[PDB]
Amino acid sequence: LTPLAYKQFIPNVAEKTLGASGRYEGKITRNSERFKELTPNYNPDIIFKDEENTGADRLMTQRCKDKLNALAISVMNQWPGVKLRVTEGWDEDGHHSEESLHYEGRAVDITTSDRDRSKYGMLARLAVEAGFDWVYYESKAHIHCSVKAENSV
């Protein structure tokens, strides 16, 4: 398989387009009507940084959890002794773009547990094969992956 290049995104369209992760609905806050859309991920095969000490990095939508758990398995098989690591999941800090999918729990920023940057291009490729709807080699320090929202009723 072929790693992504720095700043490459797949599919090669903007994140919030139909063919990628789709439109932003709105920010989910902790005491909001939509907080129930988020579920915590307690997978022992994923390392969550949780530098906030709030557990926010673990909260995500069901589709996000499904793709992330699949990626966790492929990371361990690619590099024995290494695990998937999440540095950002749902965000309440306002530390992303104004309509970031992190605010809806539909995006994660990821690394490997060893923080070996030489692996990140391949990590991004694994995220694509794990089925994330948009994958962006955003920083030398992390990959940004997002998923579609569930369909309206």
Residues that bind Zn ion (CB under 5 A): 107, 109, 144
Q: Which residues contact 110 (CB under 8 A, 6 or more apart)?
A: 71, 84, 85, 86, 87, 123, 127, 142, 143, 144, 145
Positions in 37-96 near Ca ion (CB under 5 A): 57, 88, 91, 93
Does residue 114 have a known ligand-binding role?
no
Q: Each residue of 53-67: b (16+ CB within 10 Å) or e?
A: eeebbbbbbebbbeb
Nearest distance, CB of residue 142 and Zn ion, angstroms: 7
Does residue 116 have a known ligand-binding role?
no
Nearer CB in complex with Ca ion: 88/133: 88
Nearest distance, CB of residue 58 and Ca ion, angstroms: 10
Does residue 25 have a known ligand-binding role?
no
The distance from CA 17 to its chain's CA centroid, rounded to whole angstroms, is 17
Task: List the single partner that 57 binds among Zn ion, Ca ion, none, CB under 5 to 8 Å by kind.
Answer: Ca ion
Does residue 102 have a known ligand-binding role?
yes
- Strand ranges of the sheet holding 142-146, from the earlier edge strand across to the other edge: 9-10, 134-139, 142-146, 107-112, 84-88, 46-48
Helix 120-129 vs helix 62-78: angle between axes, to the nearest 10 degrees? 130
Task: List the single partner that 109 binds among Zn ion, Ca ion, none, CB under 5 to 8 Å by kind.
Answer: Zn ion
Nearer CB in complex with Ca ion: 59/122: 59
Nearer CB in complex with Zn ion: 28/107: 107
Nearest distance, CB of residue 85 and Ca ion, angstroms: 11
User: What is the contact surface with Ca ion in residues (CB under 5 A)?
Assistant: 57, 88, 91, 93
